[PDB]
Amino acid sequence: MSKAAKAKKNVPVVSKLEADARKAAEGVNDNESEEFKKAMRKEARALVEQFNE
Amino acid sequence: MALLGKTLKGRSTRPGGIPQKRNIKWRQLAKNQEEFDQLKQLAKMKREGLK
């Protein structure tokens, strides 16, 4: 019906800020603290008693 | 201050023969604490999975 150059070569913006803080995360590995573990032992035993009553 | 004789020594235990062993277990302290620091912690986190 009609021809043929409606389409053009427009180019979008070059905004590439999608990597804002992906790498910025602190590099601290999974260092399992001991104090947390005894604390949760205590808390879990408390809630087990709670289950009991 | 020294003329005291209250203390009375014990018996005269008889035991006999088999003597001490040789130097065998001197280098086995590689993982003494680590296992205690690790085996204890390996499942020590098994409690926040409770509250």
Side-chain angles (χ1 to χ4, degrees):
Chain A
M1 182 181 281
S2 67
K3 285 194 289 183
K6 271 212 170 189
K8 273 221 161 188
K9 291 172 200 175
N10 278 320
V11 187
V13 191
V14 188
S15 179
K16 256 171 185 182
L17 290 164
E18 188 170 0
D20 269 324
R22 277 193 177 195
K23 288 183 183 179
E26 199 177 4
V28 170
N29 206 8
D30 276 319
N31 291 320
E32 295 173 326
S33 176
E34 274 272 311
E35 297 196 330
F36 284 20
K37 293 197 271 218
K38 64 91 176 179
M40 65 184 73
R41 266 170 171 156
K42 184 182 182 180
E43 300 295 329
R45 265 170 209 121
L47 283 195
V48 175
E49 186 177 21
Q50 276 201 351
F51 175 76
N52 204 2
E53 70 270 14
Chain B
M1 183 177 176
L3 186 87
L4 282 178
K6 262 193 179 179
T7 46
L8 287 157
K9 262 181 182 180
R11 306 299 292 266
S12 66
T13 188
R14 269 201 170 179
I18 314 167
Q20 282 160 7
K21 279 188 182 182
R22 295 312 171 181
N23 284 47
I24 306 160
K25 270 179 187 178
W26 291 94
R27 59 80 182 171
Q28 287 185 354
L29 54 87
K31 257 173 189 176
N32 282 145
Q33 187 66 38
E34 282 190 353
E35 67 184 2
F36 194 81
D37 280 343
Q38 271 186 6
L39 289 179
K40 278 62 202 162
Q41 66 181 357
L42 190 76
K44 203 181 181 179
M45 61 175 308
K46 182 157 158 56
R47 285 78 172 177
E48 273 187 356
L50 317 177
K51 175 193 246 189

